[PDB]
Paper text:
In this study, we use unbiased antibody selections to identify functional antibodies capable of either activating or inhibiting PAD4 activity. Through cryogenic-electron microscopy, we characterized the structures of these antibodies in complex with PAD4 and revealed insights into their mechanisms of action. Rather than steric occlusion of the substrate-binding catalytic pocket, the antibodies modulate PAD4 activity through interactions with allosteric binding sites adjacent to the catalytic pocket. Consistent with previous structures of the enzyme alone, PAD4 forms an anti-parallel head-to-tail homodimer in C2 symmetry.
To further understand the molecular mechanism of hA362 activation of PAD4 we obtained the cryo-EM structure of hPAD4 in complex with hA362 at 3.5 Å resolution. The overall structure is a 2–2 complex, containing two copies of hA362 bound to a homodimeric PAD4. Although each hA362 Fab predominantly interacts with the N-terminal domain of each PAD4 (buried surface area 1,196.3 Å2), the Fab heavy chain (HC) spans across one PAD4 monomer to make an additional interaction with the C-terminal domain of a second PAD4, close to the substrate-binding site (buried surface area 183.9 Å2). This readily explains why the binding affinity of hA362 is lower to the monomeric PAD4 mutants as monomerization eliminates a portion of the binding epitope. The specific interaction of hA362 with the I-loop mechanistically explains why PAD4 activity is enhanced, as the substrate-binding loop (S-loop, shown in purple) neighbors the I-loop. The I-loop engages the S-loop through an electrostatic interaction between R441 and D465 and this interaction is important for catalytic activity. Our structural results further show that the I-loop and the associated S-loop can be stabilized through hA362 binding and directly facilitating organization of the active site. Through cryo-EM analysis of the Fab–PAD4 complexes, hA362 was found to bind and stabilize the interface loop, which has previously been shown to stabilize the substrate-binding loop on PAD4 dimer formation.
Numbering used by the authors:
A (entry chain E), E (entry chain B): 1 to 221
B (entry chain D), D (entry chain A): 4 to 33, 39 to 53, 75 to 96, 105 to 128, 137 to 310, 319 to 336, 349 to 370, 384 to 395, ...
C (entry chain F), F (entry chain C): 1 to 215
The structure:
């Protein structure tokens, strides 16, 4: 069977460099064209570059011409992509895909799992959690909204649960939004019968593994 | 051409390309009959198969053999055009003359994008639709069944040995530019093309990256291979090839008999001449301005021993361009030279202290066979330049031109006639005619110029009546080389029928210089207008390209 | 460098219906197109490798077509597994590909009014020099909503972020989080805070409000 | 030609060389009459002077002009011969064909002096009279008044750009060597000659120092200048020049249809063949043995991708000489190739991992236009060599030869016929015919060899009846390149009508191998004697040079 | 007027090197061929080498091929001859001569004065003078022969006179002969009336300037 | 490499006579020859620059000729200034010259018997370990002479040197110096020393002798 496995991802500084690799199994890369496709968070697909080791040609998208270099090793059955002068706009998941041009079609059949490349000056930093206590300002009908803010953290992801997973009903955890500061901020909220306030436990558990930070925050009036 | 297997062992299949005659292998496996389906034509001489039109499906036509055996046929159209008849937009090897064939390239040596100082052929990009007017267009025409390319592919390539002489671009949007990518070039000699099924036409733009030289004959060949890809674990086989041959247009020089277009530049006299000649006068060193021509466009080119939108620049390089000139069109012992011959000066035989034009310049000019070179003797001069004794002007009669030589004999005859009429005191004539050392120095020069008179009339097909002897004296320097005695009246500025001649300051009789009256009596009868310029001695003149097309010559 | 536009940017249907996604090229590409499907967290999967023709292993529900420079994907008898983001790929001679903007197919349901909540900044945040005012729009449909911040009648711009959840797997609604980010000083300058919400499901605009210091 | 001054101002004098027509300048200084003395002939068309014989004194003849003016004439004989008609000892430019003209040189690439390992053209000396048989002889013939050379001198020279391609020796004692000194060579392009007065003949020996190549067209020109030295304080002037043009003989290869001379070398079978073929068998790597020919001598030459008295050596260099072969003489669409064409293998289109013969070898072989090259497809083989599928043998009938190709189709047909007659157990035939992987590997090879069948019959002017299909199977290796399944029966040793064929070890019926009986049934009807050699796979064979002279071809 | 002046001569060791020069006056050497001609003591003329600066060619005699190199400087109007690996057989006077080949003849018109090159292992050494006293063994008729031997000296020349030049009649001084030792030996003799023996002074004066040696030797019975 | 022989090696005449010098080449050189004259201590002077033709400034007494490969110089009315060594020069195409052996022209006179003298080694030389025995041949004509050393009847070879003077300007005779070089030990071994002289002018051989130690 055919498999593509990407590696070489991680976090880098603006103006720096990074090399990606993708190991092939089930076929010999010398008989296929290899493509890289970029997808920024919340955006669509952007074609980056292609190489055809059988002919030795390379092509690049206008957005990376003069910075990116693509290459391949037919003895290691592996493709490479060398990045230089990276900017914040280059943050995205990079996919490696096979193009079997010998079959007469232009579509890309086998794709890898993708590797995330992040370009930022932000340091590793634990979240600051702030309770959103329930009150008459969050009450509607027979229920009340409450939650936690998990602000000023880096890098992604943060995993949030309530009562250590005991409370999942009515719980909505939002995707985080990148702030202009370079840190991420998310909210996590739950809607509960108001008859439960002050009796039911509402502790949010925020886990940010990159900084070994665990915050247990009780939310109450 | 291509052999197709036919056998009773099992049914077979083959692809035939329209215009190609193929052979059927029937006698190798079993007196027989051939039953061909509609649109299939088979002749016996030895069995030749051909098809009338391309198929819409795999195995559309068949041929049955009865002695039984069965062959399936798929017809396709695959061809590459590239302007083979030399007229443009036309839609074997390269040959010369009005009855020949073969495509032509221009070297992309101009600068159409004004945001950069680089030459257009130095990069791997087409940055503007104007640069496409300097490139040769070729169309790849195909017609196949909609599913044909699932077991076949097409590859375009250039021979590895000439991959740094040509670059081929993808014509996205056809006649328009859309930041075209590269198909072939200095980074790789071959590439596959994703050709879909049905009837299609893809355009390519081909440019030359270099001029002809010692290691480059001028021909470039582009070939398309059709490969059989039907078995994915088995190496690909070639089943059909087709190709076109291009020649790179050579650099051509313009002589003094071609009508002028513009002058780059005392200026009061040049402006007066530019106005009478109806030329454009504008604001560099001495350089030779020529051109390269193809059926679709003509481009001016500068030769340097500076670039503009359609103003080309070429180098390929101790004697400066005063030593390189061109004759008018000639006929030499029955052979025609529609573009003339290229004249340069050197030594009559090499020595341990002689001078000659650098071999790289002789090889560059000789590598472009449309204008044959001629060797003249100039090492006897202090500077070694042809322009010091030889120049050409137009003439309305038999030949169409005159060859002008410096003549010490014409000046001494003119001075002796003035002395005989009692003008020996004019400035003196008696002091020049009595100077034995000056006469002996000119006797050496007389034999030198007369040797060139023989080389010029032998190589250029001329008569003595085609040559004018203009009075000019010479003296030898402290190193024994010849220098002019008085301002050179042969090395003049020619703009059609108007001549910008350096002014002499010799003896004057009745208000006119004797040297000016003698020059006028030789040139004015031809319709040429003579003006004598004070202190004549960074001027360049561009002439109109020849009306004759260089690819119709047979070198 | 041939450009393309893909539309509609958002589609909706129930299970069993018929939907189409289209894209326009500025110039013809001689049928050199492909179609992909993507689910959150997965690499794109190839459906169509050339105009019309289907990739091996894909359900018969999918088929493509061309009319001039307009290309279409048709999905018949739409199944729960077909609700995903789709992309149109434009290709040509040589390995250089261009992708469209992409279109999301979501699940059709009855319009639902949002539940609007507002929270003041807590003392723990105010003591650090920052303040966030939170406005929640819980359990509404469709996804599009208009939320504005109006503090002491002064409309805010540039300091409000939004985040929206994926469509709920149980009731097909959306939740939207709207947060107003202020410094401690900019917060103290003002008294009356309000989050005004307009949505298709509200018979009239709904505003929640509070006064700084009055709790 | 050369212009002579005539004037009433004072008497003049000129030198005329026998065979040259000169012009008299009469109308420039004063309707007139010409009175010529005995032995002087003057025609009017424009006054042309010629002389019947050389003078014994200065000013021996005169011409009087009456309108008065007086001209004195001295006649001389100055000419250089150099074997212009191509027959030897004969006593303009170089041209091709039986109706052309021009001299020929050999490259002095043998080793006639056995006291040194150096090549004879590498030094500046002639150490033995035998080395003179490899050099081209030219005679300088002169006749002048006894005192003529007191005011004149003669200089022999070669153009500076080709001075490292030729060396010219002084023939002290004529046909014999006497430690001859150098007149011209790599250390200086020109030298004066001390020619005495009266009737004399001086001999020169001219040798080429290099073979034709990309930067060397093959032509060398030697010119003699006559200078006027009469004024010792005044620079010398040229008054007459004459010259001869040589071409350097190209390297020519011998095909399998030329009669053999000697074999360098299992040996029991080679000795048996050498005896039946009447050849000399003696005791190196594989090299291609050819020759260079001039009207006066033929020399064998070895081409290396070792020197003897008349056994030449040339280099000019990853595919070895198993990939370079030669066809017999052919006619291609009306064009004759009396010496055949040179065949070498490469790739059908270049890629990032393909193979080809190094460009220096393609340029060297192409630079010698007497045997045109052909490109064949061989990169599909594990070694990439032409000799693996293609060979030639003699034939007594229409064509004079046969083209032999490997044919997997001929072997599978032979095995299927044995299987049909009940011999499937022979070693097995049933295990080969049932092997689907082996059949698919040979299907790829069938298309590869069939592509070469088309290239060979198109470029060599052949019919299908001129080609024999010899049974041979192939398998693909771990790198997907083709290798032989059983010993190669096409790559044989050819000595006239006797064939040294590698022995197969395939299925045997009634005491004979089926592969040997099939090969015999194809070759023995032509008169060819077949012997099968055990373990066939440093052997070289020298063939007789062509009876046709290469300078009579028109490339 | 035309003049050739040679220099660069002297004494060298076997296996060594020496460069000769010849300055030209009255003509420009670039228009003439320049020759060197060797004459060993007591022998004839041997042609050595020639150069033609106008064409750049050089030629050498078989006896010096591979050792001698000839050159010229057209800015200094001077010719040169470089010797290498000299042997005792190369001892001779070397002449420089002009060949005006532009005049049509092969003869050499102007010659210089010549410069002596000596190749020897011998050191500078003063003569040992030995009288040859007159006696009945050297008497014939009315006269007697007497003389001096001047043996074992190096280098040449030695000047010998009698009675400081007063006695020149009947005096014969012989050219010296090179001995196998590397030193020279000469004899100088005089014939006198025998009636003068013991009355007339017979002192030979031997002067060998290279060693500053002067020997006054009285010759008597 | 054409070789040549010049002869006679010695010529003699009185003032006013006619003499010729010849040289033979092994192969023809197409008249490429020259003639030179040399006096002791002077560079060679050019007389003839080509076969026959005389160099400017030379007296009319000199002229050359050719017959096949044999070249001749004729000197008419021979003057005192013409008595010198002459050389024949062979030349050819290119500047490579070959010289002949050379010939000396001397003055003719009546044959004169040599005066033969012998000297024993002096004590001053014997004390240093060497000995020279001197034999003089004074004032004889012609130049050629036979001188041999015979010590105790044992003829010597290899240890005898000879030197000969130039022809006397006053009486045209020659003097010859013959010296026998012995070590002190080789001298003591022998007793009777003799110098034997034979010449055209001696009616009988003349020998002078002495006995070691007897003075
Ligand atoms: Ca460009
Ligand atoms: Ca351009
Ligand atoms: Ca342009
Ligand atoms: Ca010019
Ligand atoms: Ca040699
Ligand atoms: Ca030889
Ligand atoms: Ca030989
Ligand atoms: Ca071969």
């Amino acid at each position: 069977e055919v498999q593509l496995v990407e590696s070489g991802g991680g976090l880098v500084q603006p103006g720096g460099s990074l090399r990606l690799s993708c190991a092939a199994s089930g076929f010999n890369v010398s008989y296929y064209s290899i493509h890289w496709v970029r997808q920024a968070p919340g955006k669509g697909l952007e074609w980056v570059a292609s190489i055809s080791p059988y002919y030795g040609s390379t092509y690049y998208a206008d957005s990376v011409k003069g910075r990116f270099t693509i290459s391949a090793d037919t003895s290691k059955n592996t493709a490479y992509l060398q990045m230089n002068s990276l900017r914040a706009e280059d943050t995205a998941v990079y996919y490696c895909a096979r193009h079997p041009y010998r079959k007469g079609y232009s579509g890309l059949d086998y794709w890898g799992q993708g590797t995330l490349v992040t370009v930022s000056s932000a340091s590793t930093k634990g979240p600051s959690v702030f309770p959103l206590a329930p009150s008459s300002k969050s009450t509607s009908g027979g229920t009340a909204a409450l939650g936690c803010l998990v602000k000023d953290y880096f890098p992604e992801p943060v995993t949030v649960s309530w009562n250590s997973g005991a409370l999942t009903s009515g719980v909505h955890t939002f995707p985080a939004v990148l702030q202009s500061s370079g840190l991420y901020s998310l909210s996590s909220v739950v809607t509960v019968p108001s008859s439960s306030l002050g009796t039911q436990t509402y502790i949010c558990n925020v886990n940010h593994k990159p900084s070994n930070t665990k915050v247990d925050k009780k939310v109450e009036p | 051409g291509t052999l197709i297997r036919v056998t009773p062992e099992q049914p077979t299949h083959a692809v035939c390309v329209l215009g190609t005659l193929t052979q059927l292998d029937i006698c190798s496996s079993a007196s027989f009959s051939i039953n061909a389906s509609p649109g299939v034509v088979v002749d016996i001489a030895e069995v030749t198969l051909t098809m009338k039109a391309a198929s819409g499906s795999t195995g559309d036509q068949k041929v049955q053999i009865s002695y039984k055996a069965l062959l399936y046929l798929t017809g396709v159209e695959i061809s590459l055009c590239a302007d083979i008849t030399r007229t443009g937009k036309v839609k074997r090897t390269w040959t010369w003359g009005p009855c020949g064939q073969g495509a032509i390239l221009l070297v992309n040596c101009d600068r159409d994008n004004l945001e950069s100082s680089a030459m257009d052929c130095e990069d791997d990009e087409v940055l503007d639709s104007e640069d496409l007017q300097d490139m040769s267009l070729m169309t790849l025409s195909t017609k196949t069944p909609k599913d044909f390319f699932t077991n076949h592919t097409l590859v375009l390539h250039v021979a590895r040995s000439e991959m740094d002489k040509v670059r081929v671009f993808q014509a996205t949007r056809g006649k328009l530019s859309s930041k075209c990518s590269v198909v072939l070039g200095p980074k790789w000699p071959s590439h596959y093309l994703m050709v879909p099924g049905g009837k299609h036409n893809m355009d390519f733009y081909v440019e030359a990256l270099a001029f002809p030289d010692t290691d480059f004959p001028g021909l470039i060949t582009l070939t398309i291979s059709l490969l059989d890809t039907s078995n994915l674990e088995l190496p690909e086989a070639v089943v059909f090839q087709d190709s076109v041959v291009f020649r790179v247009a050579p650099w051509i020089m313009t002589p003094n008999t071609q009508p002028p277009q513009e002058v780059y530049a005392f200026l009061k006299s040049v402006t007066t001449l530019a106005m009478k000649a109806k030329c454009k006068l504008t604001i560099q060193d001495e350089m030779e301005i020529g051109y390269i021509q193809a059926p679709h466009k003509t481009l001016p080119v500068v030769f340097d021993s500076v670039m503009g939108p359609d103003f080309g620049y070429v180098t390929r390089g101790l004697d400066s361009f005063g030593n390189l000139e061109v004759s008018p069109p000639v006929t030499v012992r029955g052979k025609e030279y529609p573009l003339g011959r290229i004249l340069f000066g050197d030594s009559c035989y090499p020595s341990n202290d002689s001078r000659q034009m650098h071999q790289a310049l002789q090889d560059f000019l000789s590598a472009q066979q449309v204008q044959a070179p001629v060797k003249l003797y100039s090492d006897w001069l202090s500077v070694g330049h042809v322009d010091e004794f030889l120049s050409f002007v137009p003439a309305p009669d038999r030949k169409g031109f005159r060859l002008l030589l410096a003549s010490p004999r014409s000046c001494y005859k003119l001075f002796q006639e003035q002395q005989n009429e009692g003008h020996g005191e004019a400035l003196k004539i008696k002091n020049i005619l009595s100077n034995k050392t000056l006469r002996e120095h000119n006797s050496f020069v007389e034999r030198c110029i007369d040797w060139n008179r023989e080389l010029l009339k032998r190589e250029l097909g001329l008569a003595e009546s085609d040559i004018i002897d203009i009075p000019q004296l010479f003296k030898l320097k402290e190193f024994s080389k010849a220098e002019a005695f008085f301002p050179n009246m042969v090395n003049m500025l020619v703009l059609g029928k108007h001549l910008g001649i350096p002014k002499p300051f010799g003896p004057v009789i009745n208000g006119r210089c004797c040297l000016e009256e003698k020059v006028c009596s030789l040139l004015e009868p031809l319709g040429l207008q003579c003006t004598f310029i004070n202190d004549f001695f960074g001027t360049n003149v561009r002439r109109k390209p020849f009306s004759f097309k260089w690819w119709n010559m047979v070198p | 460098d041939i450009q393309m536009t893909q539309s509609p940017s958002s589609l909706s249907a129930s299970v069993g219906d018929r939907v189409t996604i289209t894209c326009r090229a500025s110039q013809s590409v001689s049928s050199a197109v492909a179609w992909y499907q993507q689910k959150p967290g997965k690499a794109p999967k190839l459906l169509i490798y050339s105009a019309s023709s289907l990739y091996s292993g894909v359900p018969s529900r999918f088929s493509g077509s061309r009319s001039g420079t307009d290309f279409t994907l048709t999905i018949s008898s739409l199944q729960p597994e077909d609700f995903a983001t789709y992309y149109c790929q434009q290709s040509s001679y040589l390995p250089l590909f261009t992708f469209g903007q992409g279109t999301k197919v979501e699940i059709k349901r009855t319009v639902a009014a949002p539940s609007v909540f507002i929270f003041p900044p807590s003392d723990s945040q105010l003591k650090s020099g920052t303040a966030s005012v939170v406005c929640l729009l819980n359990n509404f449909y469709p996804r599009e909503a208009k939320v504005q911040w109006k503090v002491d009648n002064a409309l805010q711009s540039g300091n409000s972020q939004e985040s929206v959840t994926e469509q709920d797997s149980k009731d097909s609604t959306y939740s939207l989080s709207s947060t107003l980010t202020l410094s401690k000083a900019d917060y103290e300058k003002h008294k009356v805070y309000a989050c005004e919400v307009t949505h298709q499901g509200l018979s009239s605009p709904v505003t929640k409000s509070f006064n700084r210091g009055e709790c």
